Write a protein that holds these residues in place. Structure first.
Motif, short mmCIF file in Angstrom:
data_model
loop_
_atom_site.label_atom_id
_atom_site.label_comp_id
_atom_site.label_asym_id
_atom_site.label_seq_id
_atom_site.Cartn_x
_atom_site.Cartn_y
_atom_site.Cartn_z
N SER A 1 2.22 10.57 0.42
CA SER A 1 3.25 10.12 -0.50
C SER A 1 4.59 10.02 0.19
CB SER A 1 3.37 11.11 -1.66
OG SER A 1 4.31 12.12 -1.36
N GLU B 1 -4.89 11.25 3.31
CA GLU B 1 -4.76 9.82 3.54
C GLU B 1 -3.72 9.56 4.62
OE1 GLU B 1 -3.45 10.41 0.05
OE2 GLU B 1 -5.38 10.67 -0.95
N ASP C 1 -5.43 11.56 -8.92
CA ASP C 1 -6.43 12.49 -8.44
C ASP C 1 -5.69 13.72 -7.96
OD1 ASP C 1 -9.42 12.56 -7.96
OD2 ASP C 1 -8.71 13.19 -5.98
N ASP C 2 -6.00 14.86 -8.57
CA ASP C 2 -5.45 16.20 -8.45
C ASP C 2 -4.10 16.33 -9.13
OD1 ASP C 2 -4.62 18.73 -8.00
OD2 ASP C 2 -4.68 18.68 -5.81
N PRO D 1 0.82 -1.22 0.00
CA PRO D 1 0.00 0.00 0.00
C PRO D 1 0.85 1.27 0.00
CG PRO D 1 -0.71 -1.54 1.71
CD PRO D 1 0.62 -2.02 1.22
N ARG E 1 -0.89 21.24 1.46
CA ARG E 1 -1.36 19.89 1.18
C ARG E 1 -0.19 18.93 1.28
NH1 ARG E 1 -5.31 17.99 -3.57
NH2 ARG E 1 -5.28 15.74 -3.14
N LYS F 1 -10.35 21.77 0.13
CA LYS F 1 -10.14 22.71 -0.94
C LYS F 1 -11.29 23.68 -1.11
CE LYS F 1 -9.37 19.40 -3.92
NZ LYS F 1 -8.94 18.64 -5.12
N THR G 1 -14.82 6.58 -0.12
CA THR G 1 -14.10 7.24 -1.18
C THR G 1 -15.06 8.14 -1.94
OG1 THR G 1 -14.56 5.62 -2.85
CG2 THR G 1 -12.86 5.15 -1.33
N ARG H 1 -0.78 15.72 -8.72
CA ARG H 1 0.46 16.21 -8.16
C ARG H 1 1.19 15.09 -7.46
NH1 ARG H 1 0.36 17.22 -3.15
NH2 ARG H 1 1.63 19.10 -3.32
N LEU H 2 2.51 15.18 -7.43
CA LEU H 2 3.32 14.24 -6.67
C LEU H 2 4.63 14.93 -6.36
CD1 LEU H 2 4.15 11.47 -5.60
CD2 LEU H 2 4.88 10.90 -7.84
N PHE I 1 1.71 2.12 -3.39
CA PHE I 1 0.50 2.37 -4.18
C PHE I 1 -0.06 3.76 -3.91
CE2 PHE I 1 -0.80 -2.14 -5.45
CZ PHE I 1 -0.70 -1.84 -6.79
N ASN I 2 0.09 4.23 -2.68
CA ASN I 2 -0.40 5.55 -2.29
C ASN I 2 0.15 6.62 -3.22
OD1 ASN I 2 0.99 8.02 -0.56
ND2 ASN I 2 -1.23 7.87 -0.26
N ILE I 3 1.41 6.46 -3.63
CA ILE I 3 2.06 7.41 -4.52
C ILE I 3 1.13 7.76 -5.67
CG2 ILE I 3 3.91 7.55 -6.22
CD1 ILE I 3 4.70 8.26 -3.45
N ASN J 1 -9.18 7.16 5.14
CA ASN J 1 -10.17 6.27 4.57
C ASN J 1 -10.62 5.17 5.52
OD1 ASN J 1 -11.59 6.23 2.06
ND2 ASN J 1 -10.76 4.19 1.72
N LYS K 1 -2.09 6.21 5.64
CA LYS K 1 -1.11 5.62 4.76
C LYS K 1 0.29 6.10 5.06
CE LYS K 1 -2.59 3.70 1.33
NZ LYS K 1 -2.19 3.31 -0.06
N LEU L 1 -2.05 7.63 -5.44
CA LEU L 1 -3.31 8.20 -4.98
C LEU L 1 -3.40 9.68 -5.32
CD1 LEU L 1 -4.44 5.71 -3.60
CD2 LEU L 1 -4.41 6.93 -1.51
N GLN L 2 -2.26 10.33 -5.53
CA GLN L 2 -2.26 11.75 -5.82
C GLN L 2 -1.86 12.05 -7.24
OE1 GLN L 2 0.61 13.33 -3.23
NE2 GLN L 2 2.29 12.83 -4.61
N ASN M 1 -11.12 4.07 -7.64
CA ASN M 1 -12.01 5.20 -7.84
C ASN M 1 -11.34 6.32 -8.60
OD1 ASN M 1 -14.61 5.75 -7.50
ND2 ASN M 1 -14.38 6.81 -5.55
N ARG M 2 -10.02 6.37 -8.57
CA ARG M 2 -9.27 7.42 -9.23
C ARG M 2 -9.01 7.16 -10.69
NH1 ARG M 2 -8.74 8.56 -4.02
NH2 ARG M 2 -7.53 10.41 -3.49
N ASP N 1 0.18 15.35 0.98
CA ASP N 1 -0.19 13.98 0.69
C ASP N 1 0.77 13.09 1.43
OD1 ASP N 1 -1.65 11.97 -1.03
OD2 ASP N 1 0.39 11.61 -1.71
N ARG O 1 -6.87 -1.04 -3.26
CA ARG O 1 -7.87 -0.40 -2.41
C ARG O 1 -8.87 0.43 -3.21
NH1 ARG O 1 -7.98 2.42 0.64
NH2 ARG O 1 -6.41 4.07 0.35
N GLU P 1 -10.19 3.16 -2.84
CA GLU P 1 -9.64 4.50 -2.97
C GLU P 1 -8.83 4.66 -4.24
OE1 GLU P 1 -9.25 7.30 0.28
OE2 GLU P 1 -7.18 6.61 0.45
#
Ligand SMILES: Nc1ncnc2c1ncn2[C@@H]1O[C@H](COP(=O)(O)OP(=O)(O)OP(O)(O)=S)[C@@H](O)[C@H]1O
Ligand SMILES: Nc1ncnc2c1ncn2[C@@H]1O[C@H](COP(=O)(O)OP(=O)(O)OP(O)(O)=S)[C@@H](O)[C@H]1O
Ligand SMILES: Nc1ncnc2c1ncn2[C@@H]1O[C@H](COP(=O)(O)OP(=O)(O)OP(O)(O)=S)[C@@H](O)[C@H]1O
Lengths: 570, 145
Positions: free
Chosen positions: B57, B100, A408-409, A397, B53, B38, B29, A411-412, A400-402, B141, B103, A404-405, A468-469, B55, A463, A465
């Motif tokens: 990550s 999140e 969606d939106d 996970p 923000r 936002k 979700t 950015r990383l 995988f979270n990487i 989540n 995570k 997640l952004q 859905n993205r 994240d 997941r 989450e």
């Protein structure tokens, strides 16, 4: 001493300063910090490009114009050069007598000189510290937000003497007003016509496509460069533009970040409607995959794409050998004219939790911190790319979270902290998850059946989450008899080009192309059996006659058929 | 209930030893957890991207902590601060979205306790940062089923 009369107020008197617009609450704070009896020293702090050197040039244009308070009327803003005070100060105590000889004849005006130390953090400059505290020099510094941190914040007795009068980056609506008052400086240097569509659509386009810069430094530049492009096309050899228009701004951004909004109207829009013909030249079958890919490239070129998310984020679920990473190589060959123009990342290389530090880079204070990671670095370099997260089937996970952004939106962020925008990239994720369920249960699933099986990873991952993205879970079907009969004459066409460069020309029979289309047909292994039947039935017979001199170059190698065994004869 | 913690304290009339709002945004979700961060950051600061923000990550690692608080003194990313710490030293009144947050590693919360109760997070350089005026939102989540 008197080698320093650097008058920023007579540059504003002679009209040699650019007009500043609308920072009337950071000037009003710069004024009222400069009018107090102990440490009247503002420090226009803020990001680069924001407008903080051009606040003192709006003090100087208000002092010379009388829009100041009447206790600040008739001042003198003097831009102190650090370089000119240290230049030639070779002998001992020459800089200190130079700086004291400045501090002495700043005091002779009795507080009627506003000193401006632009790039304040360069203050060799050791000794102003008592005179800054008493209000003996009125010293508008203007240093950035990170250069104040690593010089002036280190001298904690010196950052006391300075009031940060923080200069925030203005909005798009505040940059259009900044640009509407600056265009007569660029309509007159380039002798062009910057129209108001080219200003509304240069603080809009640069405020979304540009992330490495500020806001007022991007829109202003684009117009500075579109005008120097128009004047280039005015001079060099109606139909020509005397006029920077909103399409000329987008042409200056198209070749600076990847893709414009408006360069499409001639033949690129012809080959965007021909995308599913162009992608099916290398990926036969999978119309539902080529249509779901080509719709997302059309959604972006029409400007219809959600500007926060990526251009497209697809999951390519299918069996093996059906073209899941052949589509991503035919996609990047379509839009970048090379197969190896993806940011391709085999996901099977990071099976550990520590392997997520190579996509974003190491944190501060570790090895390989200063090198970044090759997902965020390769996307920060070229912002319009295709990202192939190939074989995306891990059990972690954290890694995988990487995504997640990213999805969606869009950015990383680096380990270095630099946020990389993915809103112009096409993230493709080709895994193998419905493989033993697409093969047997093929028909009227409509990605609602193999999507349960990519949902049901949740003992480990996938997941909800994350699903859905992703914008399109894409059905990849197995290859039929008629498909692999046509992947034959792709890999056959790919083989003759490997032989024209050798100097050998091949004709194929009509049964030899039917042997590979029946020997290299396997329903469970996709089109790699045909890719192996060619390199076993027509390339190993070729190489024992290309090496052995049995086949001269130039004569047509007829690929006739013996007793069910393809033979190469001339 | 996020326009009640910024309503208790506009000039500042909440407890002045803990942030303006500390919210866990739990949910399924797609429901609006990150959109409330936002729409609140757009309400306070007139821009969606005008929040801090973070994240989560690369927050699971065994040290990503130094990513958002800063490297120790004398290490390689030391002179560039941390992501969370420098963004609130530069502007003390911000929204901090911790997207999140489950995570992330448990070592992330062990420096994020200090912002939630004390309102003050010391960093790798060794300076203390007032989070007493920021809004710390932690979307997550858990409890999605
Ligand atoms: N309010 C404004 N009105 C007019 N022009 C502006 C305004 N703010 C910025 N500019 C222009 O923006 C450009 C760059 O801004 P500057 O203020 O010179 O640089 P900066 O913001 O001080 O950043 P640096 O590199 O740290 S000096 C210049 O062409 C300025 O004329
Ligand atoms: N639909 C197709 N159209 C054209 N060539 C194809 C197609 N499917 C497979 N190929 C060929 O087979 C190879 C592609 O295999 P890949 O598609 O990369 O593997 P995959 O289908 O993505 O599945 P894997 O094994 O899980 S990576 C290349 O030689 C392609 O030329
Ligand atoms: N309550 C809502 N009101 C308006 N738009 C919404 C709402 N909930 C979801 N959306 C939309 O759904 C998109 C994704 O929802 P987000 O709220 O960003 O993600 P999330 O709901 O926080 O959940 P995640 O995936 O666990 S971070 C947003 O960009 C909005 O366009």
């Amino acid at each position: 001493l008197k080698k320093y009369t650097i008058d920023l107020t007579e540059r504003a008197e002679q009209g040699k300063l650019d007009p500043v617009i609308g920072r009337d609450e950071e000037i009003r704070r710069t004024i009222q910090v400069l009018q107090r009896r102990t440490k009247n020293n503002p420090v226009l702090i803020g990001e680069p490009g924001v407008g903080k050197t051009a606040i003192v040039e709006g003090l100087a244009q208000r002092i010379i114009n009388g829009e100041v308070p009447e206790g600040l009327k008739g001042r003198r803003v003097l831009a102190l050069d650090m370089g000119a005070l240290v230049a030639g100060a070779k002998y001992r105590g020459e800089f200190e007598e130079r700086l004291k000889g400045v501090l002495n004849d700043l005091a002779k005006q009795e507080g009627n000189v506003i000193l401006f130390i632009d790039e304040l953090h360069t203050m060799a400059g050791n000794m102003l510290k008592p005179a800054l505290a008493r209000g003996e020099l009125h010293c508008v510094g203007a240093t950035t937000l990170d250069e104040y941190r690593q010089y002036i914040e280190k001298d904690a007795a010196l950052e006391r003497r300075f009031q940060k009068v923080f200069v925030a980056e203005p909005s798009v609506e505040d940059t259009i007003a900044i640009l509407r008052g600056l265009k007569e400086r660029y309509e007159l240097h380039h002798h062009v016509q910057i129209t108001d569509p080219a200003i509304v659509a240069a603080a809009t386009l640069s405020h979304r496509y540009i992330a490495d810069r500020q806001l007022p430094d991007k829109a202003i530049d684009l117009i500075d460069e579109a005008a120097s492009s128009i004047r280039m096309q005015i001079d060099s050899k109606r139909l020509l533009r005397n006029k920077v228009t909103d399409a000329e701004i987008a042409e200056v951004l198209a070749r600076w970040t990847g893709i414009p909004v408006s360069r499409m109207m001639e033949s690129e829009r012809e080959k965007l409607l021909r995308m599913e013909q162009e992608l099916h030249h290398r990926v036969i079958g999978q119309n539902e995959a080529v249509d779901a890919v080509s719709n997302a490239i059309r959604r972006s070129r029409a400007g219809l794409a959600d500007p926060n998310r990526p251009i497209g984020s697809f999951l390519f679920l299918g069996p093996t050998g059906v073209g899941k990473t052949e589509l991503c190589k035919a996609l990047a060959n379509f839009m970048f004219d090379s197969d190896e123009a993806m940011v391709r990342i085999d996901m099977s290389e990071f099976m550990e939790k520590h392997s997520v530090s190579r996509l974003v880079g190491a944190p501060p204070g570790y090895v390989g911190y200063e090198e970044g990671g090759y997902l965020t670095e390769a996307v920060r370099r070229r912002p319009y790319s295709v990202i192939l997260l190939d074989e995306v089937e891990k059990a972690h996970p954290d890694v995988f979270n990487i995504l997640l952004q990213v999805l969606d939106d869009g950015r990383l962020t680096d380990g270095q902290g630099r946020t990389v925008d993915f809103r112009n990239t096409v993230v493709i994720m080709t895994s193998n998850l419905g493989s033993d369920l697409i093969q047997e249960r093929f028909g009227e699933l409509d990605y609602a059946h193999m999507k349960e099986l990519v949902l049901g990873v949740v003992s480990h991952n996938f997941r909800p989450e994350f699903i859905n993205r992703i914008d399109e879970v894409v059905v990849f079907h197995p290859l039929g008899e008629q498909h692999i009969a046509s992947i034959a004459q792709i890999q056959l066409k790919r083989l003759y080009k490997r032989l024209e460069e050798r100097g050998y020309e091949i004709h194929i029979s009509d049964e030899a192309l039917k042997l590979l289309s029946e020997n290299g047909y396997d329903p469970v292994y996709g089109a790699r059996p045909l890719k192996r039947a060619i390199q076993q039935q027509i390339e190993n017979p070729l190489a024992q006659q290309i090496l052995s001199g049995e086949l001269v170059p130039g004569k047509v190698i007829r690929l006739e058929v013996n007793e069910d065994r393809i033979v190469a004869v001339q």
